[PDB]
């Protein structure tokens, strides 16, 4: 059977945690309607058997056939070619849409400057996404149906929402109406709600990283 190791919630090791890469994998599993066992791994107190099969302690890790496989791109790619139906392949042209959002979001979230222009760098990436969404048929990045890029992007835009809302009182400006529509479309996906981290645990996951010693 399929099994997946993912991150446990910081301060609640028996609840699903806030790893965006783990969620991408869970989203894919749900979109292929596959059944899987879930291992909630506490990255503080990482159990021994887990280190035996992901020797870098990284998560997500999926047991498929025999082997345990790391790296969420690799994990989702194997699932696509092993369970072709329903298809999740994104046309290559759009496969990297939105790919610098999580990066610039992380940087703005941790900025103590405010003149370092990290907010502008994030706005530029949102803008690029608004531009894609408004000039290509929706509701998803590659059209009528959810595909790989949406599943990779959804967990990341959820962190952006929750984290910048909580930590900085900050929201995607109302001047990206397509981005707002797209996030609502993603967050109300069935597979999203089945695999989403409670807001609590995005907040606790990020709390020691926002402004560290």
UniProtKB/Swiss-Prot annotation:
Single Gene Ontology BP annotation: L-ascorbic acid metabolic process
Catalytic-site annotation from UniProt: 19
Keyword Membrane found: yes
Residue ranges occupied by any GST C-terminal domain in the UniProt entry: 83-212
GST N-terminal domain location: 9-82
Record-linked CDD domains: GST_N_family (cd00570)
GO-annotated cellular components: apoplast; chloroplast; chloroplast stroma; cytosol; mitochondrion; monoatomic ion channel complex; nucleus; peroxisome
Catalytic reaction equation(s): RX + glutathione = an S-substituted glutathione + a halide anion + H(+); L-dehydroascorbate + 2 glutathione = glutathione disulfide + L-ascorbate
Post-translational modification: Spontaneous S-glutathionylation in the presence of oxidized glutathione (GSSG).
Expression sites (tissue/organ): Expressed at least in roots and leaves.
Homology family: Belongs to the GST superfamily. DHAR family.
Name of this protein: Glutathione S-transferase DHAR1, mitochondrial
Organism of provenance: Arabidopsis thaliana
């Amino acid at each position: 059977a399929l099994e997946i190791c993912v991150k446990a919630a910081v301060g609640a090791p028996d609840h699903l945690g806030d790893c965006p890469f783990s969620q991408r994998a869970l989203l894919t599993l749900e979109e292929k309607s596959l059944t899987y066992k879930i291992h909630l791994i506490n990255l503080s107190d990482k159990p021994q058997w887990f280190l035996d099969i992901s020797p870098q302690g990284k998560v997500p890790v999926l047991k498929i056939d025999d082997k345990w496989v790391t790296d969420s791109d690799v994990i989702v790619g194997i699932l696509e070619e092993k369970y072709p139906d329903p298809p999740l392949k994104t046309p290559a042209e759009f496969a990297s849409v939105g790919s610098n959002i999580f990066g610039t979001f992380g940087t703005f979230l941790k900025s103590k400057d405010s003149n370092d222009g990290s907010e502008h760098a994030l706005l530029v990436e949102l803008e690029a996404l608004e531009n894609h969404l408004k000039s290509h048929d929706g509701p998803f990045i590659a059209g009528e149906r959810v595909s790989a890029v949406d599943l990779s992007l959804a967990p990341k835009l959820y962190h952006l929402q929750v984290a910048l809302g909580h930590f900085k009182s900050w929201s995607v400006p109302e001047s990206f109406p397509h981005v707002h529509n797209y996030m609502k479309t993603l967050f109300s996906l069935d597979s999203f709600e089945k695999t989403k981290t409670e807001e609590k645990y995005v907040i606790s996951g990020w709390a020691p990283k926002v402004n560290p010693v």
